[PDB]
Amino acid sequence: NMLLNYVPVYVMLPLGVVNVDNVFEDPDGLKEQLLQLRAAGVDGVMVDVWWGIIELKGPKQYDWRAYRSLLQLVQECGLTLQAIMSFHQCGGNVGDIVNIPIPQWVLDIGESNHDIFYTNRSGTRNKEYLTVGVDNEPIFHGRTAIEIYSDYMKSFRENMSDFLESGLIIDIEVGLGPAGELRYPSYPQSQGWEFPGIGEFQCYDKYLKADFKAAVARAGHPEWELPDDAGKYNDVPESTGFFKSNGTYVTEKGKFFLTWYSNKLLNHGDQILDEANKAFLGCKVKLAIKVSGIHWWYKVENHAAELTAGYYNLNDRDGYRPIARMLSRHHAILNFTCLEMRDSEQPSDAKSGPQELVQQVLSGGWREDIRVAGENALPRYDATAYNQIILNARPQGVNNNGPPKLSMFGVTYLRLSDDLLQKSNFNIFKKFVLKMHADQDYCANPQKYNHAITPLKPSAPKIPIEVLLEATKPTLPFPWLPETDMKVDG
Numbered sequence: 001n002m003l004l005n006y007v008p009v010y011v012m013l014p015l016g017v018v019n020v021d022n023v024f025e026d027p028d029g030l031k032e033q034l035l036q037l038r039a040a041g042v043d044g045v046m047v048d049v050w051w052g053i054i055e056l057k058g059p060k061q062y063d064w065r066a067y068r069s070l071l072q073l074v075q076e077c078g079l080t081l082q083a084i085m086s087f088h089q090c091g092g093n094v095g096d097i098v099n100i101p102i103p104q105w106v107l108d109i110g111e112s113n114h115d116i117f118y119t120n121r122s123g124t125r126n127k128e129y130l131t132v133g134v135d136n137e138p139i140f141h142g143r144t145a146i147e148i149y150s151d152y153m154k155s156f157r158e159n160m161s162d163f164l165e166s167g168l169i170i171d172i173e174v175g176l177g178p179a180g181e182l183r184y185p186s187y188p189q190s191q192g193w194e195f196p197g198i199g200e201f202q203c204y205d206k207y208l209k210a211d212f213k214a215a216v217a218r219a220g221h222p223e224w225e226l227p228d229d230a231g232k233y234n235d236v237p238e239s240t241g242f243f244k245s246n247g248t249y250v251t252e253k254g255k256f257f258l259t260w261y262s263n264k265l266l267n268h269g270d271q272i273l274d275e276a277n278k279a280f281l282g283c284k285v286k287l288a289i290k291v292s293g294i295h296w297w298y299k300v301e302n303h304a305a306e307l308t309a310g311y312y313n314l315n316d317r318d319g320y321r322p323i324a325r326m327l328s329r330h331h332a333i334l335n336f337t338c339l340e341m342r343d344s345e346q347p348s349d350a351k352s353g354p355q356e357l358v359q360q361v362l363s364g365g366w367r368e369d370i371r372v373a374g375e376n377a378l379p380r381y382d383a384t385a386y387n388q389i390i391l392n393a394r395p396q397g398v399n400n401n402g403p404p405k406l407s408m409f410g411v412t413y414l415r416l417s418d419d420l421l422q423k424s425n426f427n428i429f430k431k432f433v434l435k436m437h438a439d440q441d442y443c444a445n446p447q448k449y450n451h452a453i454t455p456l457k458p459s460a461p462k463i464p465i466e467v468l469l470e471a472t473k474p475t476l477p478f479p480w481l482p483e484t485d486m487k488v489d490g
């Protein structure tokens with residue numbers, strides 16, 4: 001049956017649907033929009049559950065009222081929900097039309113200890129997320145950053161138990177960094193970064209610096225220092241000593257640093273996911289993390305932008321599969337956030353390979369046998385974008401004799417806006433949804449298309465870093481069709 005080729009479609013809700021004062025502003029307005037989505041066949045929606053709004057008053061001072069009202073409305077409208085545990089700030093990244101800081105009480109601590117923030121070589125502190133450096137530092141009124149994230153998720157589970165039991169929530173996206181993605185904030189618009197700048201390493205806070213220094217001493221090179229020749233945000237790789245041909249990134253020192261730098265993220269995600277699994281143990285939901293799509297400089301040997309973001313990916317070292325393997329012990333979904341771009345849409349001097357990057361990441365996931373999902377990075381309403389998303393959702397097309405050998409677990413569209421509901425735009429969107437569903441009508445019961453959700457099981461045993469890094473071995477991607485067999489047209 002064709003229904004087995006069905007890929008669910010989700011739509012992100014507007015940023016700030018519940019304001020910074022913890023008020024669900026316009027229920028009636030959202031309702032009309034939600035009803036529009038329901039009639040269009042959309043399976044569900046995605047929303048940020050902002051840590052800065054909910055635990056604003058103080059440690060463990062949670063107020064879930066506004067969000068309960070939102071979830072209630074989503075349920076009445078017949079849609080499922082992907083809830084994001086948003087432990088980051090809204091405001092400094094692309095598309096952020098509203099400012100939502102992390103808890104003020106945490107910010108207060110940052111006033112006396114600026115090292116709780118990601119810091120660049122020049123000393124600028126980025127306040128959008130707590131540095132992985134303090135994950136296990138008990139400096140937040142007795143709690144460590146990970147304990148804060150853990151308590152938050154447990155309180156969410158307990159206070160939203162009725163919604164979880166009714167099966168409203170499809171998956172829990174655990175924010176792991178800027179924009180909720182597992183990465184370092186290497187390309188901060190707030191600091192003047194501009195596409196396609198290579199970005200900057202963000203390992204200069206006192207905690208990471210101390211860890212690095214101890215690490216190199218144990219490796220037998222206590223004299224090694226953090227990179228000092230990687231240039232600045234808007235540089236080009238060839239103009240730096242670190243990323244140029246035969247540069248520092250290829251030396252024993254550079255390789256050690258890069259491994260250390262990227263390993264911190266793997267451990268960051270792995271440990272917080274352990275907490276997320278405990279908090280939702282037994283609940284009928286799945287866990288997911290977000291991986292940023294850094295396609296610029298992907299076509300040159302140095303992969304500069306990826307390296308500064310924490311993805312140690314080169315042509316002879318897969319920096320993404322290790323993440324997928326890490327996710328398998330948690331039975332988690334890898335949500336890749338850049339799925340709609342084509343190489344020809346990027347200026348040529350940016351050396352962008354979004355299409356090749358996608359193929360590498362998705363293949364890695366299916367290779368490791370984990371579920372892969374995705375989102376479009378930028379607002380798009382044209383058929384070319386939709387056709388590209390549909391192509392990546394089912395790389396080898398539909399199978400009339402059963403399930404496709406390869407398919408994504410789901411796609412979340414960014415974002416719900418009045419522009420989307422405009423007659424013509426919404427018309428095309430409806431076709432996109434239809435094709436994602438493989439020409440089948442909306443299907444209410446996920447079990448029909450082999451997406452039944454069972455109670456979350458405890459994570460499998462910890463996988464040692466060495467076994468994880470074995471996944472760096474380059475593999476050939478699965479074959480992609482040149483264009484989808486389920487085009488939207490027009």
Ligand SMILES: OC[C@H]1O[C@H](O[C@H]2[C@H](O)[C@@H](O)[C@@H](O)O[C@@H]2CO)[C@H](O)[C@@H](O)[C@@H]1O
Pocket residue numbers: 093094178179181195291292293294295336337338377
């Ligand atoms: O982390 C947010 C967002 O960053 C990237 O989006 C890029 C985009 O690819 C470029 O074309 C350009 O417009 O700059 C954007 C960043 O400001 C990632 O591609 C995306 O996955 C991620 O969510």
Ligand SMILES: OC[C@H]1O[C@H](O[C@H]2[C@H](O)[C@@H](O)[C@@H](O)O[C@@H]2CO)[C@H](O)[C@@H](O)[C@@H]1O
Pocket residue numbers: 012015047048084086089090091093094095096179180181290337338375376377378414
């Ligand atoms: O509301 C979700 C998320 O949206 C924005 O970040 C996006 C980014 O704009 C896109 O590139 C995308 O597909 O991935 C990111 C995460 O989904 C906001 O900047 C972020 O704060 C918010 O959590």
